[PDB]
């Protein structure tokens, strides 16, 4: 499974200029493009070496799309004020998420396209790609317009066509890095809290993609209730890190094992403090 996903965010800023528009591109768990309306010379730019092979006509096209999209999103923020009877004085957010997942047959598995106003669902294209879901009554106005405009269909056209064909092209571009999974290098650290309790911390470092399972097991049953799972975080070089901590009694450490699995691990990893 591979995906191509785009993330759009526009932020109004009363008295401080046009609302800023930012669009970042992702292929699986790797940012590959980015556009920022505040940049001195607003351009869609590569953010990964394997996109540097793409010609200027490529980038110039995206830039045109993005400048358009930036204006529409600005409209949308305005329209939203009318819908919600809000003043022109406060700041507001409009976001879009969309993309395509591709299955083992290299064809569309899931197309998605959603929007949010001030961090709440606004409207979304249903999984069938032929209907929308309005989150509130305002979005219902939007839903009547997009249906009457046959928006669902052409959005389906893109997701099934342009989106997956693009994704595949990008997978080929960055085949040397995107298709190989970096396994996590795992280990356990030991941190006494008192003479009676110790924290065992299970590290997973330098893995890709982002998905991973860290679970602590006391022989059979895993201890989900008393363990601290930190959110997976970026290493900064494209890889990821995560840990799982579990407070246990002195002398009992040998009884707990950390179970790590990752797409790049042939078989689950089993660790312990010896």
């Amino acid at each position: 499974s591979h995906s191509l996903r785009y993330f759009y965010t526009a932020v109004s800023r009363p008295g401080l200029g046009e609302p800023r528009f930012i669009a970042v591109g992702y292929v699986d768990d790797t940012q590959f493009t980015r556009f920022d309306s505040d940049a001195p010379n607003p351009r869609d730019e590569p953010r990964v070496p394997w996109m540097e092979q793409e010609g200027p006509e490529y980038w110039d096209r995206n830039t045109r799309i993005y400048k358009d999209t930036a204006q529409i999103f600005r409209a949308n923020l305005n329209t939203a004020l009318g819908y919600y009877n809000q003043s022109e004085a406060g700041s507001h957010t409009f976001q879009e998420m969309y993309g395509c997942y591709v299955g083992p047959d290299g064809r569309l598995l899931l197309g998605f396209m959603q929007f949010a106003y001030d961090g709440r669902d606004y409207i979304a294209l249903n999984e069938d790609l032929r209907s929308w879901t309005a989150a509130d009554t305002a979005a219902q106005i939007t839903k009547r317009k997009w249906e009457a405009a046959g928006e669902a269909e052409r959005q389906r056209n893109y997701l099934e066509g342009r989106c997956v064909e693009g994704l595949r092209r990008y997978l080929e571009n960055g085949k040397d890095t995107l298709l190989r999974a970096d396994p996590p290098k795992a280990h356990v650290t030991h941190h006494p809290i008192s003479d009676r309790e110790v924290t065992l911390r299970c590290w997973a470092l330098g893995f890709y993609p982002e998905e991973i399972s860290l679970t602590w097991q006391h022989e059979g049953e895993d201890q989900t209730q008393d363990m601290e799972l930190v959110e997976t975080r970026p290493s900064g070089d494209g890889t990821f890190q995560k840990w799982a901590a579990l407070v246990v009694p002195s002398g009992e450490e040998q009884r707990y094992t950390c179970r790590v699995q990752h797409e790049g691990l042939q078989e689950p990893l089993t660790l312990r403090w010896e």
């Binding site: 591109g25 929007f115 342009r162």
Partner: peptide, 9 residues
């Protein structure tokens, strides 16, 4: 390539 992003709410 991104979609045209032309949707006016």
């Amino acid at each position: 390539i991104p979609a045209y992003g032309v949707l006016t709410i």
